[PDB]
From a paper:
Giardia intestinalis is a protozoan parasite that causes diarrhea in humans. The highly compact and uniquely GC-rich Giardia ribosomes possess eukaryotic rRNAs and ribosomal proteins, but retain some bacterial features. Using single-particle cryo-electron microscopy, we have determined high-resolution structures of six naturally populated translocation intermediates, from ribosomes isolated directly from actively growing Giardia cells. The translocation intermediates, with naturally bound tRNAs and eukaryotic elongation factor 2 (eEF2), display characteristic ribosomal intersubunit rotation and small subunit’s head swiveling—universal for translocation.
Unrotated state C (structure C-III) and rotated/ratcheted state D (structures D-I and D-II) represent PRE-T substrates differing in their SSU and tRNA conformations. Structures D-I and D-II represent these hybrid conformations in which SSU rotation causes tRNAs to acquire the A*/P and P*/E states. These states constitute proper substrate for eEF2·GTP binding, shifting the equilibrium toward the hybrid conformation. The D states show relative SSU body rotation of 9.6° and SSU head rotation of 11.1° with respect to state C. States D-I and D-II feature rotated ribosomes, each with two tRNAs in hybrid states. Interestingly, these structures contain a tRNA in the A*/P state, such that its ASL moves toward the SSU P site by ∼10 Å compared to the tRNA in the A state in C. This movement breaks the anticodon stem interaction with H69 nucleotide A1744, but the interactions with the monitoring bases A1410 and A1411 as well as G457 are retained. Structures C, D-I and D-II appear to trace the path of the A-site tRNA toward the P site.
Residue numbers in the entry:
A (entry chain Se): 44 to 123
B (entry chain SJ): 2 to 130
C (entry chain SP): 2 to 151
D (entry chain Sd): 2 to 109
E (entry chain Lq): 1 to 91
F (entry chain SO): 1 to 140
G (entry chain LS): 148 to 193
H (entry chain Lo): 1 to 25
Write the structure that this text describes.
RNA sequence: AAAAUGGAGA
RNA sequence: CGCUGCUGCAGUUGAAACGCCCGUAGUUGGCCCCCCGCCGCCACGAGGAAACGGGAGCGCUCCAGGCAGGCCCGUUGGCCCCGCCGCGUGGGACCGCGCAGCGGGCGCGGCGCGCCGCCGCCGCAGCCCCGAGGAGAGCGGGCGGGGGCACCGGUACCGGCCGGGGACGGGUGAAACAGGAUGAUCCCGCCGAGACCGCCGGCCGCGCAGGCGCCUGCCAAGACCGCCUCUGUCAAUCAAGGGCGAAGGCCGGGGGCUAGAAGGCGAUCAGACACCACCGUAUUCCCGGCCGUAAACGGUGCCGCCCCGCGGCCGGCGCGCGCGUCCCGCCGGCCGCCCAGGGAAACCGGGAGGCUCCGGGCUCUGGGGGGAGUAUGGCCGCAAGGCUGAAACUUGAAGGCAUU
């Protein structure tokens, strides 16, 4: 079976540790979210540590959990 | 903690070759481990190598010819005069046919054979069987 | 080694490989500078400064957007912390731990942490005394540790 | 000459445990070295179950089922034959033998 | 300081005499006798022993009928809560 | 063994060697310095002296016969130590106080073979070798 | 000794020391004094 | 348990010496 | 339930 | 005799990892800045008395010897020694450390120039590598019989109280010691303290270890995982120095339900000092101190690295999936069996492997079996005891794991 360490295979890399990969890279992303009422775009980390409130609505659009940040309003996928 | 990178690389390369895996990784690239690896490639024990580079320690991926019998390090470096180079060949080299001890001399870093012929003796970084 | 504690874990995270700025880069590097001081004006310590900038605003990496550290823009600006937050917070922890120990002395185990945290504080501060961060005279003591907040 | 890797105990990530005394020996034993067979037995003997069931004054009555734990000491277990010393091959067999899924203290 | 290294300092006022058992027992009791405990109402540690049994706190200006050698003798301290238990149970 | 190895660690190794040198029974024997004072012989091949009471020490096992030895006070240290006589029936020659030289049993301290509790061995009596007295090579 | 503390403050003042405006002359600078980076026509310098 | 009944015997021997050393002096 | 020896040395 | 170990030894059971953790010197610190300067460092000289030894030539009747010999190198006796830790000469690989912004002009600013001044002066791209599967701090979320302080609910056990009823009760291996018609045992209610937290309760989990299990709360944390959060080597092991540390013991109180060192009995056996029954004091429980030891054991110090696969359990965190505690990884820890490899073996193999092809770092410990943890000093404790620690002499095995 042909598997080569020098040229790293991207499919396995995702399952691998953020540090164990041939290059220790970020494993999280910035996601803009769509407030249903207004079209202001708020960028949020894939894992949020501090709450970001949608501009014009005082209530935080993201209540942080240990990893993924859920959103009270509908979610804009990643960057789209 | 990790003081000797070459011992963690030498047993990295030797252990991998023992299982027969040609491609091996090394946690930190060192300009001195570059010297041992390229003197291994130069003598033909090891094959084409590469360092995937982050901005940090860097990881070394080396393909092997599969012929390595033994590699190792003398920790820490002990300096021998060019007069005593041969006593160290007796203890750490199997035979005088495939003898190679990595010496460090100010005028270039070479294996034992070339150095004594150049009449300069420095410190034994690591053993190469 | 997790320092004094035996338990071993890898909890580090990987920042972006590009040393230069991220592509979206909603603001200007210059725009980034005024937000950081504003956090000194809001009173956010430097560790918390990066965290809030990271999610509240698009900026996630400081060096990529501007060639400096959270503290180096602040150090040039008026608010430069003499006691780095990593020591200020640990001194804060010793006082808080002392409060449990004074209220109840039967807790030998909490006393072990108050002994561990004092020892960590001493090691970190020997570093900042040899460097220029903390004055050579600065010495951790038991009574004024509360006042060191000032 | 270590006899068993477990050392007669299931202690893992631990240093000390509670002591439960043998019903027979009365010898204190740490929870780890105690047999702990759990036994379910009907309160009446099976032989007179029929006549007592025949005396079913209340409707749909069922026999009193008792749930208890038996914890003999190591020495109590061998002499009362709860378990038997076995050979090296038999040492790792993790099951009680003679099937018997029958619900009574006596295996019958 | 620490003029007499041995712990028998309050009772160092006796000297070589009076044995080694009595002097040690006295050290614990005597220190308790002159100790400043906290009067309940004053809540300040200003109490001393006026005479065996009756203790008073300077600030609170109140006299508490405590023990001979301590504001709260250990047995009474318990009886306190046992009366409270029966009482709370009564109604 | 942990071993402490570094280019600047000639201290740990120097103390350790000095301290752990005196662990062997043999090393301590020659390096404590007790043995020269302790031995009845002052570390010599032979010691002159005068003979004292003769002695009949029971043997152990297998050997099961009394072996006649003579206890002699060495003149130099004024101490009395017993010396095993040489060959068959050689003790009859030795009786009252006479000039006796005593020598080691090879072991140098341990009692020779299976005759228990005897550390030294007589080699001469009067002025004639006691192994010649036995063969009548040289005798009074 | 307390007076010499004031003297130490004096020597510090001559050093650049606190120049908050110089660090904050970035975002404020990008609004007013930014030069030819987008549509400004004054490219030539010195 | 011979080791226990030797060690504590040794301690009883050690104590006897203390009285003998002091009372005699 | 009790239940103690077994001289030396081939 | 690698049985003194630097090369080059052992410490899971032969002899041997401190009970545990912090900690100062000491030792050791990842990548990494080519070029400069010091370190160390080798090459490599100068000048370093021989004898002696390595070693020219030489036949005492042959060497061992000696430096003589003959028509002869100006015939000899050549040469290597000496370690000389310095001193030159050069390399700079490795090795550790390096600060003051440079620079120009005035400058020959005295047989040549420097100091030092005085000038932003215009030549400065003048100026903060990196962000370690180093560590510290931070934040989000769960994590746990983890800790203290209150609080409190059960049952049991024992001791009372009333009522009932009717001779036996206890105890065992059988027996007996002491219970009982002033009514025991027994059966229920009512109660009083004092401990204890049942089944659930585990190749579960926690914690620096000793250790950790009532209900309610309350206080300070710890580890963990996740992160485009700063800090920027603050690191590792650590004499001296500390802090803890089960039980038992001790020192004063408080407490006293059960077990129960002593002590008493009965019953055993030629003795029963005991084992076993029946009492029973100290103790056990709490508070304030001392002790500072355990088969404190995983009989295995710590921090690192590389591994051979198959499954569990716990902690997060992602992975798609008809969304089910579904799968699949990242896992940090708990582990079972085990592949090479290792081992005197037993066995280990999330190592006790990578190692007679014997050299990551760092503390500790051992050197035949006794004597001996003894003697003698010092230190510690109130004492018990701890801690440190020889010899005189003995004598041939002591021991380790395994095969019948």
């Amino acid at each position: 079976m042909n598997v080569d360490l020098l040229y790293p295979d991207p499919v396995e890399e995702q399952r691998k540790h953020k540090l164990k990969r041939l290059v220790q890279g970020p494993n999280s992303y910035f996601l803009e979210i769509k407030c249903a009422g207004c079209q202001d775009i708020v960028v949020v980390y894939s894992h949020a540590n501090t709450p970001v409130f949608c501009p014009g609505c005082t209530s935080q659009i993201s209540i942080p959990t240990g990893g993924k940040c859920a959103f009270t309003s509908q979610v804009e996928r990643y960057r789209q | 903690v990790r003081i000797n990178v070459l011992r963690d690389a030498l047993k990295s390369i030797c252990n991998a070759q023992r299982i027969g895996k040609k491609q091996v990784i090394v946690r930190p690239s060192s300009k001195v481990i570059i010297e041992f690896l390229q003197l291994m490639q130069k003598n033909g024990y090891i094959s084409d190598f590469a360092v995937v580079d982050n901005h940090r320690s860097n990881r070394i991926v080396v393909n092997l010819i599969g012929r390595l019998n033994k590699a190792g390090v003398i920790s820490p470096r002990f300096d021998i005069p060019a007069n005593d180079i041969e006593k160290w060949v007796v203890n750490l080299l199997p035979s005088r046919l495939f003898g190679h001890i990595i010496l460090t001399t100010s005028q270039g870093i070479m294996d034992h054979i070339e150095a004594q012929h150049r009449q300069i003796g420095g410190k034994v970084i690591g053993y190469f069987y | 080694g997790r320092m004094h504690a035996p338990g071993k874990g890898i909890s580090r995270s990987a920042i972006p490989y590009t040393r230069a700025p991220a592509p979206w880069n909603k603001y200007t590097p210059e725009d980034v500078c005024e937000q950081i001081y504003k956090l000194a004006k809001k009173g956010t310590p430097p560790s918390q400064i990066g965290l809030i900038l990271r999610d509240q605003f698009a900026i996630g990496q400081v060096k990529n957007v501007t060639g400096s550290k959270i503290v180096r823009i602040l150090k040039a600006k008026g608010l430069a912390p003499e006691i780095p937050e990593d020591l200020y917070c640990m001194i804060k922890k010793a006082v808080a731990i002392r409060k449990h120990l004074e209220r109840s002395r039967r807790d030998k185990d909490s006393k072990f942490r108050l002994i561990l945290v004092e020892s960590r504080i001493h090691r970190l501060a020997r570093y900042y005394r040899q460097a220029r961060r903390l004055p050579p005279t600065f010495r951790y003591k038991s009574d004024q540790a509360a006042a060191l907040l000032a | 000459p270590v006899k068993r890797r477990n050392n007669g105990r299931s202690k893992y990530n631990c240093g000390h445990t509670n002591i439960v005394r043998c019903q027979n020996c009365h010898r204190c034993v740490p929870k780890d070295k105690v047999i702990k067979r759990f036994t379910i037995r009907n309160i009446v003997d099976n032989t007179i179950a029929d006549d007592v069931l025949n005396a079913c004054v209340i409707q749909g009555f069922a026999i009193p089922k008792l749930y208890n734990k038996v914890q003999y000491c190591v020495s109590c277990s061998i002499h009362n034959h709860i378990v038997r010393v076995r050979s090296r091959e038999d040492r790792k067999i993790r099951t009680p033998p003679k099937r018997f899924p029958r619900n009574s203290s006596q295996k019958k | 300081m620490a003029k007499r290294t041995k712990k028998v300092g309050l009772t160092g006022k006796y000297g070589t005499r009076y044995g080694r058992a009595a002097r040690k027992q006295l050290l614990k009791i005597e220190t308790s006798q002159k100790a400043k405990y906290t009067c309940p109402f004053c809540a300040k540690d200003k109490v001393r022993r006026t005479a065996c049994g009756i203790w008073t706190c300077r600030s609170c200006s109140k006299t508490m009928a405590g023990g001979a050698y301590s504001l709260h003798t250990e047995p009474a301290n318990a009886a306190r809560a046992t009366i409270r238990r029966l009482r709370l149970a009564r109604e | 063994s942990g071993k402490t190895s570094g280019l600047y660690t000639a201290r740990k190794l120097r103390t350790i060697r000095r301290i752990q040198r005196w662990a062997d029974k043999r090393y301590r024997k020659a390096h404590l310095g007790t043995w020269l004072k302790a031995n009845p012989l002052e570390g010599a091949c032979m010691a002159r002296g005068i003979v004292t009471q003769k002695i009949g020490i029971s043997a152990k096992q297998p050997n099961s016969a009394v072996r006649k030895a003579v206890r002699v006070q060495l003149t130099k240290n004024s101490k009395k130590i017993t010396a095993f006589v040489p060959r068959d029936g050689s003790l009859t020659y030795i009786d009252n106080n006479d000039e006796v030289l005593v020598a080691g049993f090879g072991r140098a301290g341990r009692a020779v073979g299976d005759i228990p509790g005897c550390r030294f061995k007589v080699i001469k009596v009067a002025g004639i070798g006691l192994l010649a007295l036995f063969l009548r090579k040289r005798e009074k | 000794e307390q007076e010499l503390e004031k003297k130490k403050k004096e020597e510090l003042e001559q050093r650049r020391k606190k120049a908050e405006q110089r660090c904050k002359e970035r975002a404020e600078k990008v609004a007013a004094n930014r030069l030819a980076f987008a549509q400004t026509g004054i490219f030539t310098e010195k | 348990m011979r080791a226990k009944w030797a060690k504590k015997r040794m301690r009883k021997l050690k104590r006897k010496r203390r009285h003998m050393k002091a009372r005699s002096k």
